[PDB]
Amino acid sequence: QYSPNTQQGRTSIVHLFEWRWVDIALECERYLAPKGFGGVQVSPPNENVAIYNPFRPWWERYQPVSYKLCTRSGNEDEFRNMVTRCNNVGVRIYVDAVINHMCGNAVSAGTSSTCGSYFNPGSRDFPAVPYSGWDFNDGKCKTGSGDIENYNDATQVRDCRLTGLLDLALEKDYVRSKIAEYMNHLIDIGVAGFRLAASKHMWPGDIKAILDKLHNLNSNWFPAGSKPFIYQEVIDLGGEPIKSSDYFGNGRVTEFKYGAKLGTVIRKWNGEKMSYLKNWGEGWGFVPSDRALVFVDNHDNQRGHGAGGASILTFWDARLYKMAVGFMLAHPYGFTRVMSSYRWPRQFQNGNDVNDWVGPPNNNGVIKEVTINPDTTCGNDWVCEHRWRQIRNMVIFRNVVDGQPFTNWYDNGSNQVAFGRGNRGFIVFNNDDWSFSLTLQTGLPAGTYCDVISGDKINGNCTGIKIYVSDDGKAHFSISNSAEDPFIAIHAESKL
Ligand SMILES: [Ca+2]
Ligand SMILES: [Cl-]
């Protein structure tokens, strides 16, 4: 299940949040493939409720109306075209599957959907699937409000409505079959796996029953017997009766403790320091590496909207964000996901962003295209973190050192640390309030290496800092606490 199904030496996927199918298709060909990215997580491709108040928020896409591939990202033809073109260039597609529920029970009946499908939440009617009152958990939930009221009761967390979202009766074979019908359509089109949204709100056993109905990956692109990659969104920060380990039999799980703790450490909250990262991973109480999908931030918590709270690092905190992403991509733990966002007008009031609902860049509701500037950055308010030199080069760094052990660790007892990956790579960080100048053992072969954070290797030369490694593997590193990017990374492929 726990294999990404990515090509040979590609080790990361990027979340192109709210991107249109046509733009992702181009991106696969012009950037992702040549830069070594393993795949793309796309937003829910199935029809959702069109919410006008507020005006087309990002979260309207987590309120299904049917399973027709018709959204603001494009129609079914465009979706198929994207999967085909991306697959032909070796870049996988993973879809965000919303199968725990349909839309809000208080939503008005009518055809206010992204494809015009009629639906009536009030009478539990979704004819486009079709689903009726018999397919929901209204009679199974025991809370007085019908919604989830207390997370200390594992039963209502699964059988009741997540903040009013109509809850599907996943134990019924009919419902499980309608879900598999949807997912098998996607698999046969060519998708490589799925992100199961709101997995905590589904019984591990019901999920398994559904997965048992799924086909193997399309044999025109994947080896026979390939199973779809599955990563379940389970927010488990401890303290709840439900644990992410209960879902290991179905596939990997999102490790939300990862970004939450990395954030507090890099921000140096509660006296935490980078030197403590020496035993980062399972030692910190995280799930086993082979069951983890990791990330610094996700579409939900980058807007204070999810697990992690105020500690989560995002593109808004550029300097520290690049370091966190850098550390994540260099460290062997888990399978990594890079975030790619869009800017929205943040407006805090009493510590809360009142514009956290704002959807993707648009013209009267029509999502804007991703424009590429001559410096390779994006326009139309798309942030494109995956294109920042410091992040893109670390994505490549991870590919280069794949399989190499964690070694040659160093720390100053504070926030100046370094470590290597076998004899293929080495990275150094300075998060202290003073300069760093020291000769360290890198485990790398003698030679002149280009630092891939401050620059690039361009045929025989480096555009940024250059590092000289001696015969014994030692090299001198100098990082000022005033550096634009307070960290240096060099690897086998950046050697001159
Ligand atoms: Ca449920
Ligand atoms: Cl996620």
| DSSP-derived secondary structure for 308-325 | TGGG---GGGHHHHHHHH
Do 300 and 448 share a structural domain? Answer: no
Alpha carbon separation from 225 to 5, 87, 88, 92, 122 (Å, rounded): 11, 18, 20, 17, 43
Do 158 and 72 share a structural domain? Answer: yes
Question: Got the DSSP string for 391-448?
Answer: HHHHHHHHHHHTTPPEEEEEE-SSSEEEEEETTTEEEEEE-SSS-EEEEEE--PPSEE
Three-state secondary structure call for residue 258: helix
Do 335 and 271 share a structural domain? Answer: yes
Do 96 and 42 share a structural domain? Answer: yes
Q: Rounded distance, CA 455 to CA 276, Å?
A: 29
Q: What are the counts of helices (DSSP H) followed by strands (DSSP E) for the chain?
A: 8, 20
**Distance between Cα 401 and ligand 2 center (Å):** 25
Do 433 and 316 share a structural domain? Answer: no
Alpha carbon separation from 185 to 210, 329, 378, 496 (Å, rounded): 14, 33, 33, 48
Give Dmax (Cα) for the chain. Answer: 75
Domain range enclosing 110? 2-403
Looking at the CA of 158, name the nearest ligand: 1
> Structure tokens of 376?
């390779």
Entry resolution (Å): 1.9
**Distance between Cα 210 and ligand 1 center (Å):** 14
**Distance between Cα 208 and ligand 1 center (Å):** 14
Contact 210, 178 (CB under 8 A): no
**Distance between Cα 171 and ligand 2 center (Å):** 24
> Structure tokens of 103?
């839309």
**Distance between Cα 205 and ligand 1 center (Å):** 12
Contact 441, 473 (CB under 8 A): yes
Three-state secondary structure call for residue 162: strand
Looking at the CA of 166, name the nearest ligand: 1
**Distance between Cα 137 and ligand 1 center (Å):** 8
What method was applied to determine this entry?
X-ray
> CB neighbours of 170 closer than 8 A, spacing ≥ 6?
99, 100, 176, 179, 202, 203, 206, 207, 209, 210
Question: Got the DSSP string for 68-119?
Answer: -S-BTTB-HHHHHHHHHHHHHTT-EEEEEE--SEEEETTSPPBS-BTT---B
**Distance between Cα 302 and ligand 2 center (Å):** 11
**Distance between Cα 399 and ligand 1 center (Å):** 38
Q: Rounded distance, CA 492 to CA 496, Å?
A: 9
Q: Rounded distance, CA 63 to CA 65, Å?
A: 7
**Distance between Cα 337 and ligand 2 center (Å):** 9
Question: Got the DSSP string for 270-308?
Answer: GG--GGGGGG-SGGGTPPPGGGEEE-S--TTGGGT-STT
- Ramachandran angles phi, psi of 469, nearest 5°: -100, 130
Strands (E), 161-281: 165-167, 193-196, 229-232, 252-254
Per the listing, tokens 């299904």 go with 64
CB environment 410-441: b (16+ within 10 A), e (fewer):
bbbeebbbbbbbbbbbbbbbbbbeeebeeebb
Contact 329, 369 (CB under 8 A): no
**Distance between Cα 7 and ligand 2 center (Å):** 22
Q: Is the bond leading into 121 cis (omega within 30 degrees of zero)?
A: no
* Residues by chain with Cβ below 5 Å of ion ligand 1: 100, 158, 167, 201
> Structure tokens of 172?
């019924």
The DSSP symbol for 27 reads H
Looking at the CA of 295, name the nearest ligand: 2
Q: For 359, what's the count of Cα atoms within 13 Å in the CB-facing half-sphere? A: 25
Contact 276, 415 (CB under 8 A): no
Do 266 and 199 share a structural domain? Answer: yes
- The CATH number given to whatever domain includes residue 437 is 2.60.40.1180
Do 223 and 112 share a structural domain? Answer: yes
Q: Rounded distance, CA 98 to CA 63, Å?
A: 8
According to DSSP, the residues that pair with 100 across neighbouring strands are: none
Among 366, 385, 403, the domain boundary falls at 403
> CB neighbours of 201 closer than 8 A, spacing ≥ 6?
100, 101, 148, 157, 158, 162, 167
Q: Which helix or strand (DSSP H or E) is residue 207 part of?
A: helix 204-211
Contact 151, 143 (CB under 8 A): no
- Ramachandran angles phi, psi of 204, nearest 5°: -50, -40
Do 335 and 419 share a structural domain? Answer: no
Q: Which helix or strand (DSSP H or E) is residue 14 part of?
A: strand 12-16
From first CA to last CA, the distance across the chain in angstroms is: 40
**Distance between Cα 279 and ligand 2 center (Å):** 24
Among 403, 425, 445, the domain boundary falls at 403
Contact 286, 309 (CB under 8 A): no
Among 382, 403, 424, the domain boundary falls at 403
Do 165 and 96 share a structural domain? Answer: yes
**Distance between Cα 231 and ligand 1 center (Å):** 17
How much is the CA Rg of the chain, to the nearest whole Å?
23
**Which among 231, 272, 203 has a CA at the least distance from the CA of 280?**
272
**Distance between Cα 3 and ligand 2 center (Å):** 17
Looking at the CA of 43, name the nearest ligand: 2
Do 311 and 227 share a structural domain? Answer: yes
Q: Rounded distance, CA 103 to CA 63, Å?
A: 4
Total domain count, the chain: 2
- The CATH number given to whatever domain includes residue 70 is 3.20.20.80
* Residues by chain with Cβ below 5 Å of ion ligand 2: 233, 254, 298
Do 201 and 57 share a structural domain? Answer: yes
> Structure tokens of 393?
């080069």
**Distance between Cα 256 and ligand 1 center (Å):** 20
Do 435 and 411 share a structural domain? Answer: yes
Strands 229-232, 193-196: pairing is: parallel
Q: Rounded distance, CA 369 to CA 103, Å?
A: 28
